[PDB]
Amino acid sequence: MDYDFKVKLSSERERVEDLFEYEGCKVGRGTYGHVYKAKRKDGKDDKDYALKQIEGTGISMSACREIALLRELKHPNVISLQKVFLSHADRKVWLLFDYAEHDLWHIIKFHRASKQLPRGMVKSLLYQILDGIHYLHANWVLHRDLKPANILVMGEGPERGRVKIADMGFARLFNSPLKPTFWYRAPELLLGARHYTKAIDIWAIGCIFAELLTSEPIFHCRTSNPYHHDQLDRIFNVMGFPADKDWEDIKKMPEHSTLMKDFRRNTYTNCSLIKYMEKHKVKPDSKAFHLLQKLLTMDPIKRITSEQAMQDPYFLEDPLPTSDVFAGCQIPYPKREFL
Amino acid sequence: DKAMAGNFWQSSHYLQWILDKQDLLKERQKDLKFLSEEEYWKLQIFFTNVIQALGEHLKLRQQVIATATVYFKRFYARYSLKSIDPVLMAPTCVFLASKVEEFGVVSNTRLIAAATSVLKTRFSYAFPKEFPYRMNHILECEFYLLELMDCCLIVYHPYRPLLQYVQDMGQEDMLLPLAWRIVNDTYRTDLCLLYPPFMIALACLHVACVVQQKDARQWFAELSVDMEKILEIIRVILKLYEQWKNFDERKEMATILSKMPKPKPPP
Ligand SMILES: c1ccc(CCNc2ncnc3ccccc23)cc1
């Protein structure tokens, strides 16, 4: 390697520790990488940023794909990569984003602890989640890990109350769930589906939508094997057990024979999404319910697409979705605590 | 892998890595103090062949090999051959391109064994000594490559649109194998840095039609495209085949490699 080339690039290289104050401001601590709330040191920047230090060293397959896809993806409801820092000394990779004060895990927990304030909040959240996922799906990118903690919401600032989809599962070996919470997992995954699909993301959106309406995870439940008995039991307790006509291709699922060994139709004879949602004060003849039932369809080939869901007359009914999901109302949710 | 497939017009490829031909020639003058124009083209051909053999040995699909080739050209589009040894850069490009795909992984030991084996069994005319770099050098070079490319990793190629065009013709059996092979050959030129891939696809399909005496004038007429640009690309393809004929890489490459400017050591 040429020495002048080397020292010139070293002289010019932006280092994360020079540009950003983040020490002691850790806010996420997952397996994929630790997240910090950061402030700009240089230009007296008022805005908050998120710095993700990617777990491990070097550039792993997952790190490469995440950088590759985030570098291209540009949509208002998908989290937006501002900058990548490559720290040569310790071989660490840092990703810079705009900071999202809130997320649906904390928003939903707040309501659950308190007992959807502005009447269009749930609807506006649902619409923006569908809009972001639709953009991913139209570019042949699956999320593969959708849950409330990965639906961020921007706080005070220019993008107030805007949904940002984050923490996409950008690397899965052979696009397989079988390679190294189950509450948001579609039934086909639990029966051994070999590949992630668009439909699997839509089921998860269905689950999130139910949780926003009720404040409770709809499929709440207590090895490398994809079959989870109690999680399937919870889905049938809520949805009922699927008839042959409801899911004809269930017989092709690798764990279908295991399902038949463990489960009897009779056990769930008085169970349905209608009855479940009625107990939580959601009307079965509401446009909200009818959309929800289209998202939580057991057969993935009968599941509604993101674009079709966005066209549902639910979003034409009063109140209309708003760009700021808080609708200009004062945000009562707490800021995130530092770790 | 069809990730971002319909996004070319908002892609980093299009917006950052379709270069102006005069900017490209201006940056190349620093290496033209050491090598003639013909020698520089002969070098870029040689390293395209190195990357192809490495990718074939590792059993990667042609799109991955093409991506690795584009990374290499992008690096040397901006920097001198002396900045990092191209013997090290080639396998580093293949390695990084392989990690953009999720269907399997190239291990460290397999990458190194592949570079060592391919250079000795297939390129001993160019290189008298064994591949001297270890995995720590690949890992260091990968950081520099990712940085120069501004983390632009998704690359679009002519294979996908070619496939669509030949299916539109209803001439897959006759024209596809030849047109595909001409697409491969265009990577021996600067075309991937200068033109959108679909235009390269059309020019390759045109040459394939001429070689096989297939009249497709009416089909090309039904397209809404700048044909002057297509003819420009065809002219470069025909020029490559004349250079190919007059070039014996086996007889010439050891001499051309010795003329390359070499990386300066520290004091
Ligand atoms: C529990 C649930 C969610 C979180 C979110 C942590 N993650 C984040 N927090 C704030 N801004 C970000 C911006 C871009 C990417 C991730 C962010 C933390 C704990």
Side-chain angles (χ1 to χ4, degrees), chain A residues 3 33 54-55 130 136 140 201 219 258 279 323 327 333:
Chain A
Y3 175 77
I54 297 182
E55 197 65 44
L130 290 165
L136 296 179
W140 285 280
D201 288 345
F219 306 123
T258 314
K279 292 168 173 168
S323 190
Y333 307 104

Side-chain angles (χ1 to χ4, degrees), chain A residues 27-29 35 49-50 52 79 97-103 105-106 148-150 152 166-167 336:
Chain A
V27 292
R29 310 189 56 182
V35 188
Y49 294 87
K52 183 188 180 174
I79 207 74
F97 311 89
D98 282 344
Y99 186 72
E101 196 69 74
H102 308 294
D103 56 78
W105 190 92
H106 283 95
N150 298 344
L152 313 182
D167 289 302
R336 285 203 203 74

Side-chain angles (χ1 to χ4, degrees), chain A residues 109-258:
Chain A
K109 213 78 180 180
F110 186 87
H111 293 122
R112 186 164 161 74
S114 184
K115 296 180 180 180
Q116 61 187 194
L117 278 61
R119 62 200 217 289
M121 187 179 166
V122 173
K123 184 184 288 190
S124 305
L125 284 167
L126 179 54
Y127 188 86
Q128 295 187 33
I129 292 165
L130 290 165
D131 204 353
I133 291 292
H134 172 259
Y135 171 83
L136 296 179
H137 288 187
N139 286 289
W140 285 280
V141 178
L142 307 176
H143 192 287
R144 308 191 283 201
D145 196 20
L146 264 180
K147 55 191 176 166
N150 298 344
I151 314 302
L152 313 182
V153 187
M154 301 297 279
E156 294 292 342
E159 295 190 276
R160 184 184 202 280
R162 180 171 284 162
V163 167
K164 303 283 184 180
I165 298 169
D167 289 302
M168 280 74 73
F170 283 131
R172 299 289 184 276
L173 286 173
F174 310 100
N175 188 35
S176 182
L178 305 172
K179 302 294 189 175
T181 180
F182 306 85
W183 307 340
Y184 308 93
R185 287 202 182 176
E188 67 265 33
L189 290 169
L190 302 162
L191 294 183
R194 288 176 185 179
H195 301 288
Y196 289 93
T197 62
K198 295 184 180 182
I200 283 160
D201 288 345
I202 301 307
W203 177 271
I205 293 164
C207 298
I208 293 163
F209 184 35
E211 190 162 357
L212 292 165
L213 293 164
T214 71
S215 306
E216 273 160 27
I218 186 171
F219 306 123
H220 177 266
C221 188
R222 69 177 290 272
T223 56
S224 58
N225 166 46
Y227 190 79
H228 196 311
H229 180 273
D230 296 351
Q231 187 66 75
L232 286 161
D233 179 51
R234 176 63 185 177
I235 294 161
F236 308 141
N237 275 315
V238 170
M239 303 296 293
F241 198 80
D244 287 325
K245 294 181 180 180
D246 300 322
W247 192 357
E248 290 195 332
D249 287 349
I250 203 174
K251 291 181 181 180
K252 299 192 181 180
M253 297 306 306
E255 301 296 329
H256 182 247
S257 291
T258 314

